[PDB]
Enzyme design. Structure first.
Site, mmCIF file in Angstrom:
data_model
loop_
_atom_site.group_PDB
_atom_site.id
_atom_site.type_symbol
_atom_site.label_atom_id
_atom_site.label_comp_id
_atom_site.label_asym_id
_atom_site.label_seq_id
_atom_site.Cartn_x
_atom_site.Cartn_y
_atom_site.Cartn_z
ATOM 1 N N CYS A 169 5.447 -4.479 -7.826
ATOM 2 C CA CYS A 169 4.432 -3.624 -7.040
ATOM 3 C C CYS A 169 3.994 -4.345 -5.770
ATOM 4 C CB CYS A 169 3.128 -3.420 -7.913
ATOM 5 S SG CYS A 169 3.395 -2.469 -9.457
ATOM 6 N N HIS A 171 -4.518 -1.016 -7.268
ATOM 7 C CA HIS A 171 -4.583 -1.696 -8.527
ATOM 8 C C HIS A 171 -4.589 -3.154 -8.379
ATOM 9 C CE1 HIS A 171 -0.092 -1.188 -8.776
ATOM 10 N NE2 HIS A 171 -0.339 -2.657 -9.351
ATOM 11 N N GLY A 174 6.339 -7.008 -11.252
ATOM 12 C CA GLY A 174 6.536 -8.027 -10.295
ATOM 13 C C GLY A 174 6.987 -7.377 -8.819
ATOM 14 N N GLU A 218 -3.677 5.350 -4.074
ATOM 15 C CA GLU A 218 -3.277 4.048 -4.569
ATOM 16 C C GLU A 218 -2.879 3.276 -3.284
ATOM 17 O OE1 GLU A 218 -3.745 3.540 -7.184
ATOM 18 O OE2 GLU A 218 -2.800 1.534 -7.618
#
Length: 182
Positions: free
Chosen positions: A148, A41, A146, A72
């Site tokens: 990730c 992402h 904050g 991911e």
């Protein structure tokens, strides 16, 4: 404070950079040579900022399992003049559950942040922001924006990167040794 935080700190001080994309600032784990990982992402493009320096992306691969399900994890090769310490021998070979994990973050907003998250479950399937996702680890800590890209470790193992949360639980994508053979 103790040997979990010692291993976490050793990884942060040598094997992390601050990555900036058009989608934000992320903790980024360097694994070996000029190869690093970031949550998919983050939407890595042709250019990324590494510690506030414009850097060409030589390759970027959003990993999916053999059923074509999102993992991911994006593997990025950076046009950088310096290699990372090789930490591939700290990566697990198989999917597993863990005790006593630490989540470590380093950004402009959250420098030198370490969180004892405790027990980590092999959760498996998660609908992450609408996207079916496999190989998810879960911990019972109320993680925030904050975090990730944050690195999940136990003593002696680098097991995942933080990719989301639901207000009460946090979720990491597994790192496996087999992602980084060459």
């Amino acid at each position: 404070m103790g040997p979990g935080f010692d291993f976490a700190q050793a990884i942060m001080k040598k094997n992390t950079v601050i990555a900036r994309t058009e989608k934000g600032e992320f903790t980024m784990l360097g694994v070996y040579d000029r190869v690093a990982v970031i949550p998919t992402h983050a939407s890595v493009g042709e250019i990324i900022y590494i510690n506030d320096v414009e850097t060409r992306v030589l390759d970027a691969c959003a990993l999916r399992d053999l059923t074509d399900t999102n993992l991911e994890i994006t593997i990025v090769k950076l046009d950088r003049n310096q290699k990372f310490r090789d930490i591939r021998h700290f990566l697990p070979r198989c999917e597993d559950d863990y005790n006593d994990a630490v989540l470590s973050v380093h950004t402009s907003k959250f420098p030198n942040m370490y969180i004892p998250v405790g027990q980590v479950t092999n959760y498996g399937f998660l609908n992450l922001g609408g996207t079916p996702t496999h190989r998810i680890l879960m911990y019972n800590f109320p993680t925030r924006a904050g975090q990730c890209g944050g690195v999940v470790t136990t003593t002696g193992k680098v097991i995942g990167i933080h990719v989301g949360g639901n207000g009460a639980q946090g979720f990491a994508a597994m790192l496996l040794h087999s992602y980084f053979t060459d």
